[PDB]
């Protein structure tokens, strides 16, 4: 699951060889990599095609596995995950709490402890003790709220006032 | 030990419910115990209906009582529930004796002494 | 013990059981 730097050794018609620097050489499809994964170039000569990686370059790869039945490391192109999108939103919410900013949320339904308020994919808790019964009645319309407390990123708990 | 009784009774009037609760309470007091908590939840709708030879009860009145008494009290309470016909279903469960363990008490004592020692 | 050994004993046990039942209801047991 960790990204490592590998050096291109051979580039054949079918397969390309990469050196992870740990043990036996790894194999990758010829056209799997692109010029956007290069961090260090052997030479400064401009490249023409997107799938133009020359031997000697250093590329970023993702370690899918360490032990494989073939006997070599498994390396795959890095990919994306929405978890970062939520993390970026969470950081923004934390900054708003520090700066005492007003957050906009939409009430979805009623909850045991209070009311459920959604904030860009995060469902917060609004205890009835801090509601005027007018905001509670308004469902599906954005309203201003003040963030009071929040849990650690894994827990994903927010309390609104 | 410490026991808790959950009773499902017919949705009758308050006087009938009070009488059923009082019977259990006096049984505990007579044996030499005491009662800690008395609570009622009103009439509740059940997951499925309780059936008697010619009656169906889709709802019941629920109350709970917590008491401390000798180990012989369980049989006495069970007998009272069976005899009374206003009670539909009951259960008695034993609870832990103490809220705080010996380790927790020692930690509190040590913390207090450290504050005194620092002072 | 093998399956062959079990089968060799099986026949003799059957014969003994059959004879005992026959003598179960007789005045003079045949022996």
């Amino acid at each position: 699951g960790q990204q490592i730097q590998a050096k291109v050794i051979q580039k054949t018609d079918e397969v390309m060889l990469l050196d992870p620097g740990f043990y036996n050489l790894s194999e990758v499809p010829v056209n799997y990599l692109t010029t956007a994964h290069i961090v260090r170039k052997v030479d400064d000569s401009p490249r023409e095609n997107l799938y133009d990686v020359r031997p000697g370059d250093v590329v970023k790869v993702l370690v899918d596995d360490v032990y494989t039945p073939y006997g070599d490391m498994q390396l795959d192109v890095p990919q994306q995950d929405p978890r970062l999108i939520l993390n970026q939103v969470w950081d923004e919410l934390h900054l708003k709490m520090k700066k005492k900013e007003l957050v906009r949320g939409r009430i979805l339904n009623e909850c045991k402890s209070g009311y459920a308020v959604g904030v860009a994919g995060f469902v917060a808790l609004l205890p009835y003790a801090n509601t005027s019964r007018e905001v509670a009645n308004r469902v599906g319309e954005a309203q201003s709220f003040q963030i009071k407390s929040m849990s650690e990123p894994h827990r994903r708990r927010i309390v609104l006032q | 030990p410490l026991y808790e009784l959950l009773c499902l009774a017919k949705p009758l009037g308050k006087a009938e419910i009070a009488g059923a609760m009082k019977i259990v309470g006096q049984t505990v007091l007579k044996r030499g115990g005491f009662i800690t908590e008395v609570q009622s939840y009103g009439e509740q709708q059940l997951a499925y209906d309780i059936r008697r030879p010619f009656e169906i009860y889709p709802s019941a009145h629920i109350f709970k009582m917590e008491f401390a008494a000798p180990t012989d009290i369980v049989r006495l309470v069970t007998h009272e529930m069976r005899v009374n016909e206003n009670v539909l279903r009951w259960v008695v469960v034993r609870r832990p004796r103490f809220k705080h363990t010996l380790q927790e008490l020692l930690e509190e004592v040590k913390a207090q002494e450290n504050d005194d020692f620092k002072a | 013990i093998t399956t062959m050994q079990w089968r060799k004993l099986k026949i003799k046990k059957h014969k003994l059981r059959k004879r005992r039942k026959a003598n179960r209801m007789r005045v003079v047991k045949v022996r």
């Binding site: - | 410490l2 309470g25 005491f34 008395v38 | -």
Partner: protein, 54 residues
């Protein structure tokens, strides 16, 4: 020595709890009447605090 202090600490806490304990029938009748006049919610809606002991 510390264990003896712990025992005394437990005794002190139980005294405070004993203020709300009932051992007479007169108090039992009052508690029953108050409980019936102020019903509470069951576990179908709100989680209940489970007793852990005295």
């Amino acid at each position: 020595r510390l264990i003896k202090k712990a025992e005394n600490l437990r005794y002190a806490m139980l005294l405070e709890e004993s203020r709300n304990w009932i051992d007479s029938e007169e108090e039992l009748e009052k508690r029953i009447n108050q409980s019936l006049e102020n019903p509470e919610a069951f576990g179908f809606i709100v989680d209940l605090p489970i007793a852990k002991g005295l």
